[PDB]
């Protein structure tokens, strides 16, 4: 089970990832603070750190709580794993559209053809399928690239935003196109119920299709379109269900030889309209209008493997996550979790794929077969520690890691008293592991993938069952290292694996763009600091 370079490791490391254990100073409904956790009370003192596990720090949209899949992905990868909204928002901030290869291709086609380009997508700040800022940036870039004509097909939201917020986004859009860029024309408004169907209800898609290719709908212009929407509002027709509104007449329709960019980043609700325009699914619409010839369609992301469309943001890769890299260094490793989080210490920790690397030994501890986990809040934490202690007493693997599920899965039941017991059981397990690590020459690091159990009561005293935005601990028993935050940002989950490799005396692969957040210090200086 060993690997050839095990004897080159400077420090063996045991990494405990507690699931759903965050750092909150508010004791109300705080199952971690109120639980008896004498082990974590000591580990989380002196030289320890509090690192970010939510929102932009882990590649999630700003303000969004962490989660087990993203958390284990970021911990295992040693880099920020960007979700699409964050990656595209950064490209907007950094003016990266104007040099985007697929966008430049689309703009070249229009300039070498009939000069006509279309943008189509959900216009709101919801951030779930699209962002209005993305569309504004595309307009700016397409102007800078000198496309003669740009037409916008505005899909109404009211689902990821309030049902009457479309008027505002419409007002913002009109002012933007007229005053800010003085370029581009709004051509269609239609609700996402029609344009963004994902249930193969092609009679819905046809309403959007015929609006874009044939102006089927209510005619309007820049001066009156907002009042039309207000009229629909008064008739109980909200953004999601806006029947089409047609501007610019025939000039703004999708015509023969035109170019189309769909700017939604999420695939499920673009597969249909994009394939109707760019492939053969216009047939399903059974329209009395002919399909325009020689169209070419581009997407913000890849909507389906088998679609031919170029994408502005193709899928990213994650080479040399920690588990891959340890194997490449010929260092063996051990991953352990109970059933409910076994995928997270394998599939997600290892980069989001079913791959076990060379030298990677795994251990699955069965979760208890109970109706809900508040009935056995300790879950199988004891058996996870048992397996880890076996590995520490053997000393075979220089890197071992486990997950402890109780705080998150009991936290999800909303039962505060059960969560307190889940945290007490986790603390006991961590203490038994800690004793073994100190006996057998392992440095112990404890972290979490995101918070949960520290906030068990909602503001009305009811159950709180969700993940949180609180920081998570990062501990280290090795006295020869001091935690140091990155120079330009808060520490985050992406920094755990670079830190482990630095402690292990192993190289850090170029692909891990996280930073190590420890510095070596002399033992005498460390001891004098504490006193």
């Amino acid at each position: 089970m060993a690997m050839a370079n095990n004897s080159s490791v400077a420090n063996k490391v045991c990494l405990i990832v507690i699931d759903g254990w965050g750092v909150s100073e508010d004791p109300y409904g705080n199952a971690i603070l109120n639980a008896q956790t004498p082990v974590m009370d000591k580990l989380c003192s002196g030289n320890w750190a509090q690192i970010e596990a939510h929102g932009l720090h882990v590649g999630l949209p700003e303000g969004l709580m962490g989660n087990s899949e993203v958390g284990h992905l970021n911990i295992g990868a040693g880099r920020v794993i960007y979700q699409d909204i964050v990656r595209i928002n950064l490209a907007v901030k950094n003016n990266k559209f104007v040099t985007n290869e697929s966008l430049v291709d689309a703009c070249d086609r229009a300039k070498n053809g009939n000069g006509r380009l279309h943008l189509a997508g959900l216009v709101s700040d919801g951030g779930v399928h699209s962002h209005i800022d993305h569309m504004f940036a595309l307009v700016k870039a397409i102007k800078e690239l000198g496309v003669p004509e740009l037409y916008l097909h505005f899909y109404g939201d009211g689902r990821d935003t309030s049902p009457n917020s479309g008027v505002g986004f419409l007002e913002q859009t009109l002012e933007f196109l007229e005053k800010t860029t003085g370029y581009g024309k709004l051509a269609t408004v239609v609700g996402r119920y029609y344009a963004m169907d994902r249930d193969n209800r092609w009679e819905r898609i046809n309403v959007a299709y015929e609006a874009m290719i044939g102006g089927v709908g209510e005619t309007s212009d820049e001066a009156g379109v907002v009042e039309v929407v207000r009229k629909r509002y008064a008739a109980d027709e909200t953004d999601e269900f806006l029947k089409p509104i047609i501007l610019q007449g025939e000039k703004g329709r999708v015509q023969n030889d035109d170019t189309i960019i769909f700017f939604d980043y999420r695939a499920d609700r673009m597969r249909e309209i994009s394939a109707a325009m760019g492939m053969d699914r216009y047939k399903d619409c059974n329209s009395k209008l002919a399909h325009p010839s020689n169209l070419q369609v581009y997407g913000m992301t890849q909507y389906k493997a088998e679609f031919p469309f170029k994408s502005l943001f193709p899928p990213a890769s994650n080479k040399n996550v920690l588990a891959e890299w340890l194997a490449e260094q010929k260092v063996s490793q051990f991953h352990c979790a109970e059933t409910e989080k076994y995928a997270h210490v394998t599939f997600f920790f290892n980069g989001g794929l079913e791959k076990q690397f060379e030298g990677e030994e795994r251990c699955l501890v069965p979760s208890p077969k109970v109706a809900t986990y508040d009935l056995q809040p300790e879950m199988s934490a004891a058996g996870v520690a048992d397996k880890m202690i076996e590995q520490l007493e053997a000393g075979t693997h220089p890197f071992i890691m486990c997950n402890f599920a109780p705080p998150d899965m009991v936290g999800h039941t909303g039962v505060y008293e059960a969560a307190v017991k889940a945290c007490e059981a986790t603390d006991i397990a961590i203490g038994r592991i800690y004793e073994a690590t100190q006996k057998h020459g392992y440095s112990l690091m404890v972290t979490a993938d995101h918070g949960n159990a520290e906030k068990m009561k909602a503001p009305d005293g009811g159950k709180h069952t969700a993940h949180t935005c609180y920081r998570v601990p990062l501990t280290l028993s090795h006295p020869g290292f001091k935690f140091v935050d990155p120079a330009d940002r808060h520490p985050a989950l992406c920094d755990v694996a670079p830190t482990v490799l630095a402690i292990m005396g192993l190289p850090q692969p170029a692909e891990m763009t996280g930073v190590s957040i420890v510095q070596k210090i002399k033992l005498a200086a460390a001891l004098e600091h504490h006193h």
Binding site: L64, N67, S68, V70, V128, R266, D408
Partner: peptide, 13 residues
Amino acid sequence: XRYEYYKYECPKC
């Protein structure tokens, strides 16, 4: 939150 329950902004858990 608003991303319920997309993989992996907000998976079922």
